[PDB]
């Protein structure tokens, strides 16, 4: 298939680390040579050892075996360690490349694909392709070296008998397959034609009522006697054939052995043939069987591994987020305009937001209220170009977003929400995340203090340097919300999107976040997804959007005088 | 467990056929002796054969191998054939005993149990227990003979090496097990303690939105760099442990071999040690491994087989139909009385037939009409004691049925129905089923003629001797109904139960069954499960039975004047 092409595009990654692979190959070749030399040892032991009284050739054999085995052990350890070094560095490079490309993909993917399968793709898939390729390579090298060593040994010791053995073996193999196939065919024939007598046993055993009513138990017994005798005869024939199967296989095998011995009997063969030579040749042939099987399976293993790696590679070069804007904006000080904005979620058919006209003023606050799933979060996701608009315009500082690079635009917008992601790091590196090289410690402490998030930090292990994480020290919901407000305050983001909490926290916690958010943070161009009424009444412009279409817009008093849907919603509040 | 008790319970079945078992045992013992002698052959070939120039010892070996092999083949054939003979006759006897008892089980059993599972019980279960016991016996005998032969050979050739080898081998086995267990414990520990680093890589992989908004791609890449390096190091630790695992096993194995050779080096054992002896001993030890494994598995195989046979035996000695009546009735000429008959189906809870007072007169006809499932077939099933009543009395010829044997009572009642069971036999043996030794061919032809079932038999292949069956020549519904009426007519049954057809047949067929049934068959004490209105209005006494109990009784005109449920039922007709 195309697996070899995948290996061609894969070798570049392994090319830097070829030294360990070469050492592993040398170690494997030496291991195979060690095993074939251990087999070589078998000749002198039976030839110049036990025979006669030559003691020397035998008082060294335990030491020779010990040395060969310790060489095998150390070379196996070196081979495995270095092959795993190459595999580990290949996995490291592949995972790093996959993740580097990963960050920067359309958000829709993490919506449709959960983190479980994606983490599996990062770890398990790369580990599997590495394990498969490493196993295939080590099997090929080791078994090939062992096989060529065994062949060279068999030919070197006595070729006059090595040729006969290697010629007869395929013949006997194919004869065995032919006989087994023929007799299994006979077995299948008998098995398919078995089903012609048991119907008689079934039929007689369904008429229990007619047998009893007419009183014919003896006749039924006679009939079952006959049918059982016939069944036993059929089983007789079945077993007779199935049993005469195997002794034919033993017949051909032992006949082959007899022919080998007879060929050795002629003086044409024994020009160089001692007992040790015969034992070495036969033992080598016997021990050569397993390497052939492993070498045959290596190809399927390699193909499967390279198929998985091809799937990973195809994933690697998928589409990325489009960055075709070139202008860079600093300190945006204008308005946000939604002009005939219609958007559909990629994958869904029904539009989630239709024909929106909206004006977010510079420095004023707008509360966008609606029900859950009404599209009141799609607008917030859209203002940062997480999803592209199908039609319309998003007008910020006099120009549209797709004319702007994502870095500057996303630096111009902050998201203060109850749910916040906390990286495994310190508070000082979390407040100024990705910008710790621009802000000093004093500014970080100042921002934490004006967020009213400073008090619970002085009660931590190291305070302004304690390690936080999603797999470590956990902060409360109010605490993480406060830390997010501190992060937003230090960066001084022109534009804000605020996801308000769905539930009230503790009285100390609520008052803190409330005071911080209102007097310190809320001084910029803001859009708030209001859930509580208190924020709604202190909003400069309130817009009610349902099913992706705005219903009414104005001020709270104006909307109440309008007696629209928001009037009913507030009445419930 | 209790398997051995079942085996003793089973031996009697095999006791008649012990000759074949003895022959099979002798053949198996001789087969094992043949194999161990084939191994014995390995010594002269390497000792007085290939070495030196002794031609004779080498030119006979192919013929010796051929003779041993043909002996093995013929003895395997004889052994398997005789063991199959014993198994086949045991299965035949067991099936016959099971079926003979089976015919006497309460009808409810074939209602609750289908014929498929019961046929499986008869065939597959007995075959499985026979195969298991035969395999266990042949394995035990063959492998035991082979093992004792190998042991006696190893001890006879050179005991100074046989004791050392058979002492060292268990030590090496337990050492291998201990080392493998320890290192697998280490592997499990490392595997469980891995799960502390991948959670981090999962953590940063969930906050895709916060990374993009704050612009922290480089920091995220650095974090994944560190975590990937740590992951690679931990995988390194695994690979080092699992790689150093195996060479320890090879170390201890090769050290054992070195110790064996060193023990052979001392003159303590070399009082008798040639190359042929060493090869024979080592090859025998190598080839002894498989018989031990088979002998260990034989016990589990035997236990499973005997458990299945115990299940079959438990089914064999279950309850049978109760026959505690002793009076015998010939030519019943009285009335059938149902007195307060309340009956429940065994297994169901709701009564199917409650508190009936019913009189079936001698020679008059009663039509029992009702809906499907109303209990109008339970009465017919009940009149033949297929199911015993819970309370009440069934009064026939002045006595209850339970005072009467089932044979006479069932000979006093015939069932003429559309659905009829046709046994695989001739027409003359089906018309006079179970009574062909009492009736002549002339009477059979007469009965067939008055049933108007003679015309379609003269057009058959052999007429009154054609083989019918449910797996052969099939008759039409009208034809089988006619043959059933002929059977009932020849026997001249005092009491009749007639299940009328639910659908009209062909015009020639309808007239044949009708005229026969009315003019010829309908002259006795009869109960008809009427479905057509024609039979209803020509009935002496008509009873309407609802699912719970009878409601009205009388004549057709009387019941119409009653304006009861039967009036409405006839109105639909």
Task: Describe the model.
- The structure is a homodimer of 573-residue chains.
- Chain A is of the alpha/beta class.
- The first copy, chain A, folds into 2 domains: 3-317, ABC transporter transmembrane region fold, CATH 1.20.1560; 336-573, P-loop containing nucleotide triphosphate hydrolases (Rossmann fold, 3-Layer(aba) Sandwich).
- Chain A is 62% helix and 10% strand.
- Chain A has 23 helices and 12 strands.
- Chain A has helices spanning 3-14, 18-40, 42-49, 56-59, 61-102, 108-112, 115-157, 159-193, 198-204, 208-214, 217-265, 275-287, 289-316, 378-383, 406-411, 427-431, 441-450, 455-458, 477-491, 507-521, 533-537, 556-562, 565-572, and strands spanning 336-343, 353-360, 365-369, 391-396, 399-400, 413-417, 425-426, 467-468, 495-499, 525-529, 541-546, 549-554.
- Chain A has a 6-stranded mixed sheet with strand order 6-9-10-3-11-12. A 4-stranded antiparallel sheet of chain A has the order 2-1-4-5.
- In chain A, α20 links the parallel β9 and β10.
- In chain A, α2 (18-40) runs antiparallel to α5, α7 crosses α8 (159-193) and α9 runs antiparallel to α11 (217-265).
- The longest helix of chain A is centred in the middle third of the chain and has 49 residues, at 217-265.
- The radius of gyration of chain A is 41 Å and the shape is elongated.
- Chain A starts with a helix and ends with a helix.
- In chain A, 31% of the residues are buried.
- At the A-B interface, α3, α5, α7, α9 and α10 of A face α3, α5, α7, α9 and α10 of B.
- Chains A, B: The chain crosses the membrane at residues 15-39, 59-87, 136-157, 163-180, 238-263.
- Chains A, B: Its main location: membrane.
- Chains A, B: It is a multi-pass membrane protein.
